[PDB]
Write a protein that binds this ligand. Structure first.
Ligand SMILES: CCCCCCCCCCCCCCCCCC(=O)OC[C@H](COP(=O)([O-])OCC(O)COP(=O)([O-])OC[C@@H](COC(=O)CCCCCCCCCCCCCCCCC)OC(=O)CCCCCCCCCCCCCCCCC)OC(=O)CCCCCCCCCCCCCCCCC
Ligand SMILES: CCCCCCCCCCCCCCCCCC(=O)OC[C@H](COP(=O)([O-])OCC(O)COP(=O)([O-])OC[C@@H](COC(=O)CCCCCCCCCCCCCCCCC)OC(=O)CCCCCCCCCCCCCCCCC)OC(=O)CCCCCCCCCCCCCCCCC
Ligand SMILES: CCCCCCCCCCCCCCCCCC(=O)OC[C@H](COP(=O)(O)OCCN)OC(=O)CCCCCCCCCCCCCCCCC
Ligand SMILES: CCCCCCCCCCCCCCCCCC(=O)OC[C@H](COP(=O)(O)OCCN)OC(=O)CCCCCCCCCCCCCCCCC
Ligand SMILES: CCCCCCCCCCCC(=O)OC[C@H](COP(=O)(O)OCC[N+](C)(C)C)OC(=O)CCCCCCCCCCC
Ligand SMILES: CCCCCCCCCCCC(=O)OC[C@H](COP(=O)(O)OCC[N+](C)(C)C)OC(=O)CCCCCCCCCCC
Ligand SMILES: CCCCCCCCCCCC(=O)OC[C@H](COP(=O)(O)OCC[N+](C)(C)C)OC(=O)CCCCCCCCCCC
Ligand SMILES: CCCCCCCCCCCC(=O)OC[C@H](COP(=O)(O)OCC[N+](C)(C)C)OC(=O)CCCCCCCCCCC
Ligand SMILES: CCCCCCCCCCCC(=O)OC[C@H](COP(=O)(O)OCC[N+](C)(C)C)OC(=O)CCCCCCCCCCC
Ligand code: SF4
Lengths: 69, 136, 67, 149, 78, 183, 353, 155, 105, 119, 93
């Protein structure tokens, strides 16, 4: 759930660009099925890994790079 | 971002739950410091009674610059439930300048984090050393 | 034998001490930049003792002195 | 479940000792070997075509009072405190290049310049009373009076 | 004698046990220090049953032969 | 030990500064009537390597020089100069012999000593090669007086104290002779 | 110019060796603060600082740059001396103690037969450096924890000093290299396991780290002695505290766990067998292995410093003084006589080779 | 340019202007450090350390220990400077002009093949040759341990 | 009789040999008085301080002035810095004036 | 009193003090300088010792302490490290709940009770 | 410990064999400098007919080498950095 096995799998699936965005605001390289975007532009993902903890099965990827609101 | 543990009332429970393992304020570089000298922020959480207001000013004035104040909850903002009380300051803004107001009763542990983030977004907008070059 | 290398190390730490003293006097923003309300000497409220907020006004035991 | 994120700071601390150890070991060894290559810079830095493999010389610790004499002896033989030379016969320069340190024997400055530490009944006698020197001057004077007879 | 303090000249064994239950820091400190002299006095048992002592180190300068100079010594002359 | 003395170079240049130390040369030579001798020109590592071989070849001459000191009654430096040249000439003999007979094994040994802080325990493999080669060309056997023959340290098969870092040339030369000479 | 450049480095190389040495210690010291929160984070099911620099690596630098650029509280306009002597003396005392730690064979800036005394002497100066912090700067919270502080790091300095001498008695030398190199066939954790516990207990109390943390008793003395300190005086003092945690972690590895010596000599020779000894690349790798061998050992105690802090409550102050004097001192004064008795009984009085 | 002289000149100044017990304690440290450093170079390195381990490590932090339990209460500049400048004119504690201004040397000898530290010789003499001095000093330390309790312990 | 003047390695120092001959002279039974041992005691103090020898150096320095002799041509050449004991100064044939290594042995 | 404060051995009657060169009264007007002529021993329990009442170390375990679960000015009077008298100062959080309930209905007064104990 | 004693025994004897060789060279260094001193003293005090050239030790059966010298050329005086422009020790510059 926190070991390098999960991080490396999520690193390879996402590619460098998306992961490096997660390495700039998220601080946790995660992957998941895209469930669509809103009007503003945020991309809403859901994780299908059997290793994520209870509350971390839905996350977002904001439009901005440096600042997230 | 090292605030000061100025928990006064029921709002103080939420300020502890941010440090709890679920949210872990420490991951963001937030380490509460008890002494005002070591703390550059002051999260005024809870009712500020009249009997406390003179003491609050002494604690605030001892923070070395730069210094910020966050008003969390209803009591710290404008009086809250006890707005019509004979011994409750109606809003801590009568005593210390405030840089961000977190609304709630009590504000959820995420609401305080959101209030922290907005103040962080303000600090990253500081332009002091360019102000000397261009505005001074 | 031969402590010239150690001697330079002692010099470097001494020189490095002043760098801890001086770097603050140059990096910090001047008083006028943050709030301008007053200098450290003038700002008596800040340049005062801390007593949990409220103003106040070591006779140690024999054993502590005896240890 | 080994948290690799928590192990990140220790890797840098591991590299913290390595930088000190890696530089200090390689730099000190490199310099010591370089100064043993000859009595001059023209041969210290010029790698020889006719030389064999470079043999290094790690730094010496736990030295004793003989090693101080050995280092000076090697200096007077090969212009370095750790020179290498196993010739049977030393050079003609080695005969008359011995170095003998001449130094003073005065008391520490703190002994004779502290405002307090320089005051004692016997120190004032040394500093302001001629009784000690008048006697000890006669012995010096007798050296020249006892020659011609 | 439910919990009486043992008398040292009447019950030596029980007096030791009192200071081994109620003052552990004193009893076991002395015992560790007691092995020091105890093993030192056991050395004459080692000198005959385990091995004999080493020869003393030559820390007295160059060993000078107990004789006179040899007049006949020659060679390596000028 | 490493205490500041007035006879040899001290720890740091600051020590020389406090003492106002002057390093003085003498341009003269020995007076003509004192016969000339060629000083030994080996540094620390060669001598530490050859200290026991110098002892075997020069045993009668080391003792006479030291016995002369005792019989000089404090006047050693003037009354044992003739004996002093005998020791120097015999010592030069061994260094020259090791250079024309066991040159390869000699350099392999003291270069190991320079590599491992001049400690005798760190160069056993480069020493066993040298002892065997010397015994087959100069009849000189290393001996440590005072103990039995079978208790000398360099003959111990499993020494408790081994070097931390193995010399490569010592290992290569040992294995090169491991099968060739020691079939 | 290449003739005036190659000899120029010959005139400046040893200064760079120290600078490389200086940065080596500071990097470990800087990232001990980051490693503390991470280690103390997961142990508490937290996460630790992971959002200041990539994976939280740039966390110490943020605190150093933040604190160094704050207003400095002063009693008067030009009264900088009082709020600087306490942190400066403490920093220089532990910085000079690094002049003796050997990274390998003779890889120490200071090598003398009195390394232990110099190491212990520099420890005393830092002790005197701390008591200056709570002195005459008013009297609210610093002077409350100065008779308390002084009576603590005085008493355990006895037990810490005795443990060092008992190790030095076994090797009959006061040179750290000799102590390290004499543990080839045995690590003093095996014979002197009680001393390693006693050393570490004294190592914790001297540095004022918890559980023996009544100097800065957070629930009792706000910030302890640093409640007045802010900005640069805080950085110097805080940097002084953690250098001791690195140093005392390293000293424990040097004395009881063999120092830079390899875990296995078989693996050690295999790795060094791959690099030609005539190229400088061999000596770069050799230093990394020996220093890495010391680093892993020193890491475990730096981990242990955080480990004990996350699992043991604070110890009441009066029981600290009654601990070392009544318990630790008699034990450490007993092994100081148990060791010579055994060594002499089997005719094994140590010598310096 | 012996920089040791300047430091003592400073200490010779703050000693005259010392007012409260803070200043006097700082005089003791500022006297020990020039002693320790000038011994680390020059004469004896072993006793430069033995000063720090005993003087600073035992007595000086006991000085400031008791001083916090004692009290904390409360010509010009040209006279103090004039006193120092006249006091600085002569600084030769001896008056043997030949012994001061003439340098000497010693000749090293190779006889002592058993090189040992100065502390080993002291132990080799203090524990065997002069054992009585050691055993009396132990007796004195025993007197102090019993002495210090009886003075302070009220009961 | 108790030892005096023990060198740093545990043996007699430079001036112990002159100290022993004083003790032997004084305690010998053949001497009616202590007049014979007057020169032996003067040598022991000479060994420790060299005061008479230093006086002879003071005269030679003083006397060299009055004849106009220059210390450059009568004195013993010396080097004052320990890093400048160059191989050219040391007399090595190929040596050059570069500074020698005294940073770390 | 308020600002400052002021036996086993027999009360011994000694009168007629004399020296070898006169009487006590002959040199009375001069003996104040002579410290060895004083007639008031300092070990006597009745000896007049007038010392000001310097108050004991009263640390404020005040509002700005992490140990405090709120704002508590715990005025602790301690000598050394023992505890002599403690006088907690509650009221730094007197919001006046009992006064406000009197003006609100029974349903509107319920949320006041969740704010008494935060947990 | 019993290993370090046997190793120490080897170290002591290794220096024992080298001691006559090294001390012989050291004796010839002391002898040369002692003779070199009285070469200097005779030069300076040549015009003093009553002067005696003798050591300051009354006992004439014990060798006491001189331990004082008259300083001359400052060889590294003109030295800058990295290159001690050493003055020619023998003869003029
Ligand atoms: C042992 C070898 C394990 C191993 O190396 O592989 C597993 C490990 C990955 O763990 P994992 O894939 O999550 O294990 C499978 C389940 O997730 C594991 O999750 P789980 O919950 O199913 O199993 C947990 C398992 C724990 O799993 C283990 O067995 C780890 C044991 C490590 C003990 C070390 C001491 O059991 C325990 O919890 C034992 C806890 C009690 C141990 C007490 C310590 C006594 C000593 O591989 C790694 O080592 C990668 C992490 C470290 C990478 C090194 C580089 C990091 C970055 C450095 C900067 C560049
Ligand atoms: C041995 C036990 C003994 O005879 O005395 C028991 C004695 C009785 O104490 P207690 O039973 O608790 O008191 C009950 C009566 O009130 C005790 O009052 P008490 O009047 O019945 O006895 C006090 C004692 C007077 O106490 C002493 O004389 C002790 C002398 C130092 C031992 O007088 C005697 O008992 C005379 C016979 C003992 C003479 C011991 C002579 C030892 C050779 C020196 O206990 C000790 O004195 C312990 C002394 C040993 C302390 C540890 C010393 C360790 C030093 C070596 C460590 C390094 C290796
Ligand atoms: C009390 C016991 C005294 C008896 C004793 O042990 O001393 C005698 C012992 C000499 O006896 P021995 O074995 O015949 O000598 C062999 C010489 N190669 O001498 C020894 O060498 C034994 C040393 C043990 C005594 C020292 C420890 C005494 C206790 C410390 C207090
Ligand atoms: C690392 C060096 C740091 C140096 C910090 C202080 C620098 C000032 C110069 C002091 C050193 C000179 C030697 C005399 C000892 C100090 C005696 C003294 O009077 O110090 C005065 C110091 C400055 O205050 P000032 O205004 O000048 O005097 C009137 C104060 N009402 O006021 C004080 O009382 C000092 C308050 C701090 C005391 C800390 C302990 C003393 C310093 C110990 C380390 C320094 C070692 C000595 C270095 C110099 C050696 C000559
Ligand atoms: C290592 C740390 C690196 C990051 C911090 C760099 C800040 C230094 C530049 C600066 O301070 O720029 C602003 C300044 C002055 O402007 P001020 O607002 O009065 O600054 C107050 C700073 N005093 C105390 C020096 C007056 O300009 C300069 O004179 C630049 C030189
Ligand atoms: C040996 C080896 O392969 O070690 C891998 C090394 C060291 O790992 P580290 O993170 O310093 O281990 C920390 C030490 N503990 C785990 C014992 C606490 O990794 C790097 O040098 C990258
Ligand atoms: C050593 C290298 C460490 C890199 C760490 C890093 O890149 O640090 C990131 C920095 C600091 O800002 P931050 O808030 O940590 O940005 C990351 C946000 N996280 C933590 C939430 C993921 O941001 C930047 O990338 C902008 C500046 C470029 C990096 C500057 C690092 C310092 C200089 C190093 C080279 C001289
Ligand atoms: C108690 C723990 C001991 C310990 O940590 O041991 C670690 C062990 C045994 O090493 P050891 O015998 O204690 O000492 C080391 C002695 N060498 C230097 C001869 C190896 O390492 C391994 O071989 C893995
Ligand atoms: C065989 C080995 C074991 C023997 C056990 C004997 C126990 C003696 C005991 O406990 O002695 C008891 C006495 C008296 O105790 P008390 O408190 O006065 O009265 C006891 C309680 N009453 C009032 C109910 C009776 O205490 C002592 O003198 C303690 C000596 C402490 C020595 C500490 C230093 C040790 C250093 C170790 C070496 C460096
Ligand atoms: S705003 Fe609400 S939760 Fe916060 S202190 Fe006031 S009543 Fe309590």
């Amino acid at each position: 759930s926190s070991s390098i096995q999960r991080t490396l799998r999520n690193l390879w699936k996402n590619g460098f660009k998306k992961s490096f965005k997660q390495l700039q605001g998220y601080n946790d390289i995660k992957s998941g099925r895209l469930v669509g975007t809103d009007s503003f532009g945020n991309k809403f993902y859901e994780v299908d890994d059997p290793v994520e903890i209870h509350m971390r099965t839905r996350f977002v990827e904001y439009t901005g790079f440096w600042r997230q609101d | 971002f090292w605030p000061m543990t100025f928990g006064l009332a029921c709002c103080a429970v939420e300020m502890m739950h941010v440090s709890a393992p679920r949210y872990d304020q420490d991951r963001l570089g937030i380490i509460f410091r008890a002494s005002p000298r070591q703390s550059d922020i002051m999260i005024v959480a809870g009712t500020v009674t009249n009997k406390m207001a003179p003491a609050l000013r002494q604690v605030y004035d001892q923070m070395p610059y730069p210094r910020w104040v966050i008003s969390m909850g209803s009591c710290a903002n404008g009086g809250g439930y006890y707005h019509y009380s004979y011994s409750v300051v109606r809003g801590v803004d009568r005593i210390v300048p405030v840089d961000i107001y977190v609304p709630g009763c009590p504000p959820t542990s995420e609401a305080l984090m959101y209030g922290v983030f907005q103040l962080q977004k303000k600090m990253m907008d500081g332009q002091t050393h360019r102000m000397w070059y261009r505005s001074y | 034998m031969l402590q010239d290398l150690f001697n330079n190390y002692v010099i470097l730490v001494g020189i490095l001490g002043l760098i801890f003293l001086g770097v603050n006097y140059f990096i910090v923003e001047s008083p006028r930049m943050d709030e301008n309300n007053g200098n450290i000497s003038d700002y008596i409220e800040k340049s005062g003792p801390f007593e949990c907020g409220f103003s106040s006004f070591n006779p140690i035991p024999i054993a502590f002195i005896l240890v | 479940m080994i948290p690799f994120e928590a192990l990140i700071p220790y890797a840098i601390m591991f590299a913290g000792f390595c930088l000190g150890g890696g530089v200090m070991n390689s730099a000190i060894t490199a310099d010591i070997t370089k100064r043993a290559r000859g009595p001059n810079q023209e041969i210290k830095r010029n790698v020889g075509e006719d030389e064999g493999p470079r043999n290094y010389t790690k730094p010496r610790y736990n030295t004793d009072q003989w090693d101080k004499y050995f280092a000076v002896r090697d200096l007077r033989l090969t212009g370095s405190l750790r020179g290498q030379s196993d010739n049977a016969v030393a050079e003609e320069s080695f005969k008359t290049n011995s170095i003998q340190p001449y130094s003073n024997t005065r008391r520490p400055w703190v002994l004779r310049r502290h405002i307090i530490m320089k005051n004692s009944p016997t120190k004032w006698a040394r500093k302001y009373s001629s009784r000690r020197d008048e006697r000890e001057q006669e012995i010096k004077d007798d050296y020249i009076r006892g020659m011609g007879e | 004698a439910i919990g009486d303090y043992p008398v040292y000249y009447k019950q030596p064994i029980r007096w030791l046990s009192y200071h081994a239950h109620t003052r552990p820091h004193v009893f076991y400190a002395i015992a560790v220090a007691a092995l020091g002299p105890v093993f030192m006095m056991a050395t004459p048992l080692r000198r005959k049953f385990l091995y004999d002592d080493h020869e003393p180190l030559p820390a007295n300068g160059y060993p000078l032969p107990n004789r006179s100079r040899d007049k006949t010594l020659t060679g390596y002359d000028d | 030990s490493s205490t500041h003395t007035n006879d040899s170079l001290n720890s740091s240049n600051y020590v020389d500064k406090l003492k106002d130390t002057h390093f003085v040369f003498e341009n003269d030579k020995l007076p003509s009537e004192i016969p000339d001798v060629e000083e030994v020109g080996a540094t620390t590592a060669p001598l530490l390597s050859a200290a026991y071989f110098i002892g075997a070849k020069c045993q009668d001459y080391n003792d006479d020089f030291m016995l002369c000191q005792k019989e000089a009654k404090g006047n050693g430096p003037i009354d044992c100069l003739k004996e002093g040249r005998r020791v120097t000439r015999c010592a030069s003999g061994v260094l020259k012999d090791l250079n024309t007979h066991c040159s390869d094994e000699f350099r392999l040994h003291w270069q190991c000593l320079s590599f491992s802080n001049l400690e005798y325990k760190n160069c056993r493999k480069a020493e066993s090669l040298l002892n065997k080669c010397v015994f087959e060309k100069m009849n000189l056997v290393k001996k440590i007086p005072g103990i039995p023959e079978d208790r000398q340290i360099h003959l111990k098969q499993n020494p408790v104290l081994k070097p931390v870092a193995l010399h490569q040339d010592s290992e290569v030369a040992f294995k090169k002779a491991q099968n060739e000479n020691s079939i | 110019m290449l003739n005036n450049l190659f000899d120029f480095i010959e005139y400046i190389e040893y200064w760079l060796i120290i600078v490389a040495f200086v940065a080596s210690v500071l990097i470990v010291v800087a990232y001990l603060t980051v490693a503390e929160r991470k280690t103390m984070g997961y142990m508490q099911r937290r996460l630790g600082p992971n959002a200041v620099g990539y994976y939280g690596v740039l966390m110490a630098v943020a605190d150093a740059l933040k604190l160094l650029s704050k207003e400095i509280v002063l009693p008067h306009n030009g009264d900088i001396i009082y709020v600087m002597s306490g942190p400066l003396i403490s920093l220089f005392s532990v910085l000079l103690s690094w002049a003796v730690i050997p990274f390998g064979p003779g890889l120490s800036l200071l090598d003398s037969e009195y390394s232990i005394i110099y190491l212990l002497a520099s420890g005393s100066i830092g002790v005197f450096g701390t008591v200056i912090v709570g002195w005459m700067s008013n009297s609210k919270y610093t002077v409350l924890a100065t008779v308390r502080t002084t009576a603590q790091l005085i008493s355990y300095e006895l037990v810490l000093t005795t443990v060092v001498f008992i190790i030095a008695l076994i090797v009959s030398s006061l040179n750290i290299n000799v102590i390290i190199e004499s543990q080839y066939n045995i690590w003093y954790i095996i014979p002197f396991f009680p001393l390693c516990l006693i050393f570490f207990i004294s190592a914790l109390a001297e540095t004022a780290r918890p559980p023996f943390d009544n100097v800065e008793a957070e629930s009792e003395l706000v910030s302890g002695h640093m409640t007045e300190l802010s900005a640069s005086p805080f950085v110097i003092f805080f940097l002084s505290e953690y250098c001791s945690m690195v140093l005392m972690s390293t000293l424990t590895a040097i004395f009881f766990f063999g120092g830079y010596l390899p875990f296995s000599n078989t693996i050690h020779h295999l790795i060094l067998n791959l690099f030609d000894q005539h190229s400088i690349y061999y000596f770069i790798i050799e230093g990394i292995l020996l220093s890495g061998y010391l680093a892993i050992k020193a890491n475990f105690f730096m981990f242990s410093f955080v480990w004990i802090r996350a699992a043991a409550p604070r110890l009441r102050y009066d029981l600290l003084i009654l601990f070392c004097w009544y318990v630790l001192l008699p034990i450490v004064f007993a092994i100081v006589v148990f060791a010579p008795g055994i060594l002499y009984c089997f005719d094994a009085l140590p010598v310096i080779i | 340019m012996n920089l040791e002289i300047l430091d003592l000149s400073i200490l010779g100044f703050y000693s005259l202007i010392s007012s409260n017990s803070f200043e006097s304690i700082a005089i003791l440290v500022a006297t020990i450090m020039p002693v320790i450093t000038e011994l680390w170079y020059n004469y004896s390195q072993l006793f430069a350390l033995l000063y720090t381990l005993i003087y600073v490590g035992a007595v000086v932090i006991l000085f400031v220990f008791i001083l916090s339990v004692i009290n904390e209460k409360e010509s010009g500049l040209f006279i103090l400077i004039l006193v120092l400048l006249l006091d600085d004119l002569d600084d030769n504690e001896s008056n043997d002009n030949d012994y001061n201004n003439v340098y000497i040397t010693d000749y090293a000898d190779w006889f002592n093949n058993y090189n040992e530290s100065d502390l080993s010789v002291i132990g080799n003499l203090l524990f065997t040759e002069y054992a009585l001095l050691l055993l009396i000093i132990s007796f004195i330390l025993l007197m102090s341990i019993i002495g210090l309790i009886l003075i302070v312990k009220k009961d | 009789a108790p030892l005096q003047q023990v060198g740093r390695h545990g043996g007699p120092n430079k001036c112990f040999g002159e100290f022993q001959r004083v003790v032997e002279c004084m305690t010998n039974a053949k001497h009616d008085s202590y007049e014979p041992c007057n020169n032996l005691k003067n040598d022991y103090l000479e060994c420790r301080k060299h005061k008479v020898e230093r006086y002879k150096a003071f005269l030679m320095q003083k006397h060299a002035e009055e004849l106009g002799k220059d210390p450059e041509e009568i004195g013993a050449p010396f080097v004052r810095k320990r890093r400048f004991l160059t191989s050219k100064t040391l007399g090595l044939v190929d040596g050059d004036d570069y500074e020698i290594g005294v940073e770390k042995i | 009193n308020d600002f400052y404060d002021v036996n086993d051995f027999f009360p011994v009657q000694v009168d007629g003090i004399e020296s070898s060169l006169g009487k006590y009264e002959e040199f009375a007007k001069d003996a104040h300088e002579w410290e060895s002529w004083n007639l008031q021993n300092e070990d006597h329990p009745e000896y007049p010792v007038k010392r000001t009442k310097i108050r004991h170390f009263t640390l404020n375990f005040g509002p700005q302490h992490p140990a405090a679960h709120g704002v508590l000015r715990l005025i602790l009077e301690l000598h050394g490290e023992e505890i002599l008298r403690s006088d907690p100062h509650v009221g730094l959080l007197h919001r006046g709940t009992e006064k406000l309930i009197e003006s609100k209905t029974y349903m509107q007064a319920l949320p006041y009770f969740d704010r008494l104990d935060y947990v | 410990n019993r290993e370090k004693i046997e190793l120490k025994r080897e170290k002591l004897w290794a220096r024992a064999h080298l001691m006559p060789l090294l001390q012989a060279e050291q004796d010839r260094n002391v002898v040369r400098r002692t003779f070199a001193y009285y070469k200097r003293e005779g030069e300076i005090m040549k015009d003093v007919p009553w002067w005696e050239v003798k050591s300051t030790y009354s006992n004439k059966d014990i060798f006491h080498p001189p331990q004082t010298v008259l300083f001359g050329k400052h060889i590294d005086r003109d030295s800058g950095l990295m290159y001690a422009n050493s003055r020619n020790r023998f003869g003029p510059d």
